[PDB]
Design a protein around this ligand. Structure first.
Ligand SMILES: CCC/C=C(\CCC)C1=C(c2ccccc2)[C@]2(Nc3ccccc3)CCC[C@@H]2C1
Lengths: 231, 12
């Protein structure tokens, strides 16, 4: 069984085919290297992440200033978690599955990148491998999305009451869920949570790299990614 | 932090 709270979280998930077709159609309607393409994917996915958050349970109760503070804190972690889960579900050996449904060979991306991006990509695929081995599932994924979004490290929130509540109760429901549905993995809950600091680290390194690439003139023109990089 | 575009996307 799935705890009531997690059932409520699942109801807020986007229609994946609709989002997939939207981004593919936008990029189709749109002189771009593979790196530029990845930036465009990130930018378009951020619009979908904001739309998802805005309409989600609990988040929709927050005033816009609180909503902004939370998203400014975690946007890159949500992008990376989204990517990681997509590889867990749809990915395979030596290929990368994109939000458009496009599958690209890993070397097509990696051979064209320098050390920093290669390291980040490699670290991301290690998380993919680890979460595979844990049998990371959709219920756990949506829980982690909410734990990433409702961070206790965000200062000056007006409604910290609600944010701490969500963090506490999603934690409780996730533990209940993993203890129930994966009893043979007695430490699954702890192993899932250990991935959050790793995602934070990768996300911060990714932001620093993209910030450098923007200063260097390598990030294609966009609206949202650049604004979030300055968040 | 102030960010006119993010604010707009959340409000619309
Ligand atoms: C701050 C942005 C964090 C997002 C990243 C960086 C993770 C290394 C992601 C991608 C990206 C890769 C290169 C340049 C720009 C962005 C994405 N492609 C990607 C491809 C292969 C491995 C890892 C990421 C594109 C959108 C989802 C992925 C998350």
């Amino acid at each position: 069984s799935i705890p009531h709270l997690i059932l409520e979280l699942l109801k807020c998930e986007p229609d994946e085919p609709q989002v997939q077709a939207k981004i593919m159609a936008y990029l189709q309607q749109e002189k771009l290297s593979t790196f530029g393409l990845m930036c465009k994917m990130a930018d378009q996915t951020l619009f979908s992440i904001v739309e998802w958050a805005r309409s989600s349970i609990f988040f929709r109760e927050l005033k816009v200033d609180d909503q902004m503070k939370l998203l400014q804190n975690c946007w890159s972690e949500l992008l990376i978690l989204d990517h990681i889960y997509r590889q867990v579900v749809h990915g395979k050996e030596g290929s990368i599955f994109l939000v458009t449904g496009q599958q690209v060979d890993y070397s097509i991306i990696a051979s064209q990148a320098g050390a920093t991006l290669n390291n980040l990509m490699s670290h991301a695929q290690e998380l993919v491998a680890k979460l595979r081995s844990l049998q990371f599932d959709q219920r756990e994924f949506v829980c982690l999305k909410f734990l990433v979004l409702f961070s206790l490290d965000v200062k000056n929130l007006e409604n910290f009451q609600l944010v701490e509540g969500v963090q506490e109760q999603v934690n409780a429901a996730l533990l209940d869920y993993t203890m129930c549905n994966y009893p043979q993995q007695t430490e699954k809950f702890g192993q899932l949570l250990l991935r959050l600091p790793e995602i934070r680290a990768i996300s911060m390194q990714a932001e620093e790299y993209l910030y450098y690439k923007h200063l260097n003139g390598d990030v294609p023109y966009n609206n949202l990614l650049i604004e979030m990089l300055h968040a | 932090k102030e960010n006119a575009l993010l604010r707009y996307l959340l409000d619309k």
